[PDB]
């Protein structure tokens, strides 16, 4: 059949505004048919590290209830996004479990944040590492001293959120990168989203 029911899977990749890295954006896509091959075919995708399956087998296999996690990171932090690795962002902002059969895309957005951008916040201080797929949203004055922390901020009383120095005259490591992570569960019971078929 024609089966022309393309879903917003092809729209989130072209969204002008994303969310913060600690308040990473989550999208659930299902009940649609879209081609996954057109993504890596384009030459505008700088980084494509896809662990769950080979890039050419996305269309061959059918999945369920696909989940997309989107955020923005710095230029020299792309290696932090990997299952079972170290990193300040990988520990206090977003962590991948080792048993993660997912797929990762990342691309530059330097021209979209030129002057630069000073509305980005990221966690820097936390008691322990984050749990997998944890939407930890909260605000508190981080304390690192024996004396109790109360009232106004000061010594051993810090704000765990800081901005980004995304100046328009910076090279690699200071250019914003849009990062999206695709995950899915295989055939829990029904099947809604599969690869396209040609006739």
């Amino acid at each position: 059949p024609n089966i022309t029911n393309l879903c917003p899977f092809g729209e989130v990749f072209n969204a002008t505004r994303f969310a913060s890295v600690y308040a990473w954006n989550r999208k659930r896509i299902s009940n649609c048919v879209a081609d996954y091959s057109v993504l890596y075919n384009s030459a505008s995708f700088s980084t494509f590290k896809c662990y769950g399956v080979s890039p050419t087998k996305l269309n061959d296999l059918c999945f369920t209830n696909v989940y997309a996690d989107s955020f923005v990171i710095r230029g020299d932090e792309v290696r932090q996004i990997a299952p079972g690795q170290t990193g300040k962002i990988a520990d206090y902002n977003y962590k991948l479990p080792d048993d993660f059969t997912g797929c990762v895309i990342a691309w530059n957005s330097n021209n979209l944040d030129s002057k630069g951008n000073y509305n980005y916040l990221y966690r820097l201080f936390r008691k322990s590492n984050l749990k997998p797929f944890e939407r930890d949203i909260s605000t508190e004055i981080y304390q690192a001293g024996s004396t109790p922390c109360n009232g106004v901020e000061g010594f051993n009383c810090y704000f765990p959120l800081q901005s980004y120095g995304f100046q328009p005259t910076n090279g690699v490591g200071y250019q914003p990168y849009r990062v999206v992570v695709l995950s899915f569960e295989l055939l829990h019971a029904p099947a809604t989203v599969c690869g396209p078929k040609k006739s």
Partner: antibody
Amino acid sequence: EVQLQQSGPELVKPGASVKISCKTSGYTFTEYTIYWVKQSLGKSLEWIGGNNPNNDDTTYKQFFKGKATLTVDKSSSTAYMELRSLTSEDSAVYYCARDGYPYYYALDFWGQGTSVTVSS
Amino acid sequence: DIVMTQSQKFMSTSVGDRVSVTCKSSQNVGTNVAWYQQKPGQSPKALIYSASYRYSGVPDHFTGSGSGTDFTLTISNVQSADLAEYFCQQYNNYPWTFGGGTKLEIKR
């Protein structure tokens, strides 16, 4: 596995500048702050101040002006005190301590101290 | 404001009698203290933590007190290695300031 080796006694001159070193080794230096106190030959203990290895923050007491300066270095993994205006009564012993945030608050570990004596 | 006197500067116990020292503080600022032993010549050794807790590295047979704006500590007895100075702690505001100390004398 916590240890602290300091310098020996020093003789200073009034109206001069001297240095004291607190060396920390055998454990990570980044997390816990370092505190400085003094003992003036068995008198009451005074909290000279404290410093943060990571944020490079420095905090003093209400009345400390005269030698208000701290520094730390990670290459040598130590801290340096600079004493100025050794007028008439600063002859005492300096103690360098480290606290613990996960457990054992309030200066668990101490040092041998450095005795500085003022003379002409 | 900031004052610590613990109602005494030195106390004397001859033989057998239990030793106890208070750590009366200023007006209500918080509840967090400590007690350190000061042997005559070397670095201070911590005696009690928050006035009621235990140390792994000390043969702890100690009695503490409750909470509030007043503090008290009780030590086991007068052994042969108890003659030292007693220091109390108060860590609420950044300008840390301790008391005048307490001296234990074995009244021969």
